[PDB]
Amino acid sequence: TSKKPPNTAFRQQRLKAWQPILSPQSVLPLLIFVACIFTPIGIGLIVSATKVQDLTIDYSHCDTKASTTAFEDIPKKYIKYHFKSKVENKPQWRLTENENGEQSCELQFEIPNDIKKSIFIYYKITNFYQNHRRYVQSFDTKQILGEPIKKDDLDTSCSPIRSREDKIIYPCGLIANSMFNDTFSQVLSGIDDTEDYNLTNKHISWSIDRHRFKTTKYNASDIVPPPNWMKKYPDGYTDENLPDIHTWEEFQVWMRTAAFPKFYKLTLKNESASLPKGKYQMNIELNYPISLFGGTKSFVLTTNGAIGGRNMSLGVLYLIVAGLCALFGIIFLVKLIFQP
Amino acid sequence: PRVIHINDSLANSSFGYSDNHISTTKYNFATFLPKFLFQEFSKYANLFFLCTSAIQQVPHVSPTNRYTTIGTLLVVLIVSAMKECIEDIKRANSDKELNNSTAEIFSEAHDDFVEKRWIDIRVGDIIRVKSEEPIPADTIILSSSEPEGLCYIETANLDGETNLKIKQSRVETAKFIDVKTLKNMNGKVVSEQPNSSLYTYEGTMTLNDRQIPLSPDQMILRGATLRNTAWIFGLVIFTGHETKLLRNATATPIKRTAVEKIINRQIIALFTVLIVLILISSIGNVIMSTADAKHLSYLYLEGTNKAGLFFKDFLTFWILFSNLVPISLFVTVELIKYYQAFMIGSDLDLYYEKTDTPTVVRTSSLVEELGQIEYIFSDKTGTLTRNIMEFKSCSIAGHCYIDKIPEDKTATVEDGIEVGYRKFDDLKKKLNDPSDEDSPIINDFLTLLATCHTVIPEFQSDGSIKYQAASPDEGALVQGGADLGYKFIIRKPNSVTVLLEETGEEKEYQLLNICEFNSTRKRMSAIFRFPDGSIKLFCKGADTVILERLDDEANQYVEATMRHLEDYASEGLRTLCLAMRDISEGEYEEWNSIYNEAATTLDNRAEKLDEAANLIEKNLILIGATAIEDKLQDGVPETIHTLQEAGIKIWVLTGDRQETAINIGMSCRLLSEDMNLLIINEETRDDTERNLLEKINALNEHQLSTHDMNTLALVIDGKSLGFALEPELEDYLLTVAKLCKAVICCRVSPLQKALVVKMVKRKSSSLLLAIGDGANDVSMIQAAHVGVGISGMEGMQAARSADIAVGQFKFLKKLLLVHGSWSYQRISVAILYSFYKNTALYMTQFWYVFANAFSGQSIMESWTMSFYNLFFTVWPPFVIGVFDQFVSSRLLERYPQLYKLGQKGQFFSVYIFWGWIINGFFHSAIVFIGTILIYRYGFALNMHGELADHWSWGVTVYTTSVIIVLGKAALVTNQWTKFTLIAIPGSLLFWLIFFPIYASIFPHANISREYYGVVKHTYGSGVFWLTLIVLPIFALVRDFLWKYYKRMYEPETYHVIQEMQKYN
């Protein structure tokens, strides 16, 4: 038996195997068991998404629709609010102009209940293609780290925003050039006997973004701001004009690009104390025009949940599978009796 | 004319004739490149990635590397090259076993025969091949150890004929007996050209002074074998691939399967799906970046033209969507088919322990063609028969005798005349006592077995005498007389001595004259002189010739033997009738002059001698009849019957004569006794038409019954088949061949064995298998879809040239029913799963073009997408393709009707292929739409107000698309071994531990830098472990509820056999 193959279980294709069958003793107790565990998770994740209470004010078209002299009422389509109570006074805006052409929208909403959990402030941008293939990679990851990268040693993903007049644009590319620059005021100013509610601007971004984004190492003689930054930095950069992107949390939040054309970006939060009920005001200076992208910039005042907001779409999907498996556990049971 | 000098190896080398090597390799060093590339670039996916990599070479298409597709295209071309180099080395090793065999060649300098190798033989050498070793080349015999110069070759490899051929030397050259006098002969041999007509040679050997003629009576071909002669002297005239038999054999051709032909039609299905999705995204890009050019100024788009932009993103959406066609499929179709052929040749039920040869699959690319076999084109001698004859039955004095009586008719029914079976012991008991009537007839029978023949006996040192018979039936008659008691011993000239073990005394018989065997006579007559001084005539021959020449008034048992000739032919045994008569000297003294009448006519001998002998066989007394069986191999009738239950039509193509092919078919039950054979034996072109027309007129004349189809058979001569394969009569022959249950072709040439198999695959869309042994059916094996050879015996030139080489014929049952139908369901399901799982990931790249303004941005990092078809979804195709048994081995052989699942094509077509894509489109839409609703604004997290970005969401798309395509495989599999439990749930557990290791170590090394905070924001989030639960179960609830409804309320025929397997 020199050339005879071995008599083992592997070579003779007789391995210890188990054969599943889809008997009604196995499939039908599975669908009843799936339905009785996907309903406590389905109702448990809809209650957690109902418990989130927020407020959204679309402050686009504050430039033309609002009143300069007095607080007038915001239309029905711009407000979307969810609260444990009812509101009595619907939200109001006002336009306020300063000494040189700089308007600030003054939203004046009402919070009908003490929101005992942590408050976060976002801005919702719609119809902004943060996930474009030309847009997602258009920066330079070495300038973010802080080292003085030279002009031809710089990245080529900055396709038109690489260098201006043979000088190095320091925040390079498209993601930094198109940064959102409506400055939300850092306090919810209380009106008529309610106290002010202070918000903070620190620890907004990811913790890996606060470690990678470091202060730059060029002196300002070599560099120049991006084209849409010239109104903020006229006459180029100086040594005291230089922005450190290590402490600039709004730069790190915007550069973390989003997946979808409707996205939030965190701007302000307070996690120490709760805001009591009352009439509040948020001053928003309007630098970023919506004609650039063609969507609706908005002001969102949210709370967090276990799934992170008022989104029913996870607890509903736990109820569709619990409804489908408990429907076909009935269709296949009346066929088991009346059609054997 | 091939002018061949006799005694100078430098002179014939100036002609530059062929060498002696025989290579059955597919490639060599001179054509490995234009032949391996042709069989790789006839697959349509390898043509697709060649024009995908040619699109990555124009400059500004896609920021992924220019050498990421053509790098993997060389990787899939290296793996498929090393497999076809591994197999072609194994074919070259088996050719080294033939060219390195020993062959004694003459030397002019040494003046004696030197031992050398087969490959050293040149045209013109004088060789000396010994007793029972095969002939090295096409040699003309010069001398032999026999006195006149004759020898006996066996041509069971170049034909199917079982008798021995009388090859004699010329008497003008048989005087060169001694090895020392071989140097003094000079001259040339004007030979013919290489042919393939075996029985015809024409040459002219001129010796020192004048020419001698040549003829096929002194032509010995390469596939022959010397027998019953000590040595011969031959002159090699054709060698290597220039012989008569191996001239039309070629290298192993490219053989594409029917599964592989469907994949080239599933690629075209997938390619016109591909052109649609590229055309949608490239029209939607040129519409959106023109109509919304005022709301996309933050991207700083160039906006060259509408034509130049459309022709640019037509290629960037080609490169993004090129991963629908998997490149990892065509390595795991070559490695599964190579690892299936290793498991076929590792089975002990296909191992032949007697000659120690296991089955080998030399061509691993055809292991799924064994699952759908419509026809089997067998061979007879060596394939179906053992080439061993044996004396089986005798019937004398109206009785009938065998040793091994079967219990179906052991009871002699005594229906008037005795019909039945009695033992050979009772034959000797009615021989011993003289009071019985049959005992003067029984010994007269039993001396005719041991004296009437022309066998030349020889003794050995052990004392066991070996008989040298020119025909194997006569040799079995002598051995049949020997174990009955009448042993045949020493034969001197003109007397025959017989040793009688009944009395113990050694007799002797004076042989007076024997008349030779003739196919026109089909008799053999032998007059003898006895110790009595009395003259008796012994005569053996067929029943159709001597039964006309009897005295029916003298003998009284003729009616019993003719019915005894009827049940012998119902078992396919070869028969001969035995007759005798006492004659006197006075008629013999004149009949000696009648023999001297034939001594006067040397000019006429075929006509004169034989009917001068028939002057004295005008009247005889019948002794009885004999029955010699041609032994079949083990399990031959049980696999002819079982393979016909599976719907496989079994043809038999042989080189034998017609009457012994019918006798074989009656014994393996290929032909029954209640069957209507349609014999077509014609000699002209139009009489083959007229015979074919009247058969096919008389078949549609009557309504075909459901049992009249199974009582119809066809028998073709090799001369009628040479006319019926012409393009005019090609269809009448094929329409009658489709009606009859079994076809038998006789006297068929080695090329006509191939022209039949070519004629069936041209006209029918069916798959054909050809099994044979010997080099007369190498062309039959190379022209079939699967070619099986018989190994373990000498002259195994068909076991080398084949794709599969088995031990014996009965291994064709398990190789087709069990290992074929497994290896069709395995490769068809593992291919459709590999097309599916590439769709269920790379279609989320298409539903994303509506949410990123038709830019083509990917949602996973390109390193992690490359790990999909390399790490986490490679093993569930391998376990399905190598270890999946959809129905057991003992139930595949109990129900041969389950072979019609693969035979129709019920597991692999384009229509089943569309359901694995539409399930892949459906599964990808659940992943996409399920995750853009959960990750609504990036606001699915609970970590201090921080959000989920692009890359923290595309990990949720990637991971959920892994649990689905691994959850689909866990419904597809039929059995769960330990190798399944590490492939389906061990690839998921591989990815869940690979990702917090990869994304925490590799971004620090500037590799996939997108993953900096992804592990904290995917794995640390509670919404990731909730999207991973419900979203697979959403997508796999339709595949699970249809699997229950299909097997319970609408089952196929194998779903019931699987339930028999589980519960019985």
Ligand SMILES: CCCCC/C=C\C/C=C\C/C=C\C/C=C\CCCC(=O)O[C@H](COC(=O)CCCCCCCCCCCCCCCCC)COP(=O)(O)O[C@@H]1[C@H](O)[C@@H](O)[C@H](OP(=O)(O)O)[C@@H](O)[C@H]1O
């Ligand atoms: C864009 C260009 C492309 C255009 C292409 C269009 C058309 C193609 C042209 C012709 C198609 C031709 C025919 C298609 C029609 C039918 C396909 C043939 C039917 C077919 O065998 O396949 C089936 C797929 O079942 C669906 O059908 C799958 C049902 C799910 C379909 C749901 C519809 C999906 C639509 C896409 C959604 C997109 C939404 C858009 C979202 C946009 C987002 C912005 C196969 O799975 P199967 O579970 O039954 O397999 C069974 C069964 O699982 C098993 O128990 C049995 O074996 P065993 O017992 O031994 O194990 C055995 O019976 C086995 O076959």
Ligand SMILES: *[C@@H]1O[C@H](CO)[C@@H](O[C@@H]2O[C@H](CO)[C@@H](O[C@@H]3O[C@H](CO)[C@@H](O)[C@H](O[C@@H]4O[C@H](CO)[C@@H](O)[C@H](O)[C@@H]4O)[C@@H]3O)[C@H](O)[C@H]2NC(C)=O)[C@H](O)[C@H]1NC(C)=O
């Ligand atoms: C989340 O919760 C609170 C939001 O209302 C906020 O704490 C309240 O706001 C301030 C911040 O501490 C407190 O008012 C000041 O308290 C300090 C304590 O000594 C006083 O010095 C200070 O007096 C004056 O403040 C002027 C500015 O308003 C300044 O110009 C003067 O020089 C002088 O210092 C105020 O009286 C208030 O009592 C806090 N209330 C409660 C209930 O905590 C949290 O800081 C906030 N957390 C965040 C944003 O991280």
Ligand SMILES: *[C@@H]1O[C@H](CO)[C@@H](O[C@@H]2O[C@H](CO)[C@@H](O[C@@H]3O[C@H](CO)[C@@H](O)[C@H](O[C@@H]4O[C@H](CO)[C@@H](O)[C@H](O)[C@@H]4O)[C@@H]3O)[C@H](O)[C@H]2NC(C)=O)[C@H](O)[C@H]1NC(C)=O
């Ligand atoms: C907040 O963010 C806003 C959007 O990112 C930004 O608005 C853009 O600001 C830039 C610069 O102020 C505007 O660009 C101007 O374009 C006009 C054409 O209409 C030009 O006259 C001018 O470019 C000039 O370029 C010359 C060379 O060709 C050169 O002599 C000068 O350097 C000069 O820059 C302006 O640059 C742009 O139109 C604004 N709108 C949009 C929709 O992009 C706000 O400025 C920014 N505000 C703050 C306070 O940060």
Ligand SMILES: *[C@@H]1O[C@H](CO)[C@@H](O[C@@H]2O[C@H](CO)[C@@H](O)[C@H](O)[C@H]2NC(C)=O)[C@H](O)[C@H]1NC(C)=O
């Ligand atoms: C808490 O809120 C108060 C109310 O706005 C902040 O007080 C302001 O501080 C700025 C800084 O100079 C002054 O210009 C304003 O006039 C102050 N407002 C009032 C009403 O006094 C205070 O700074 C906040 N606390 C922190 C730590 O920022």
Ligand SMILES: [Mg+2]
């Ligand atoms: Mg044969």
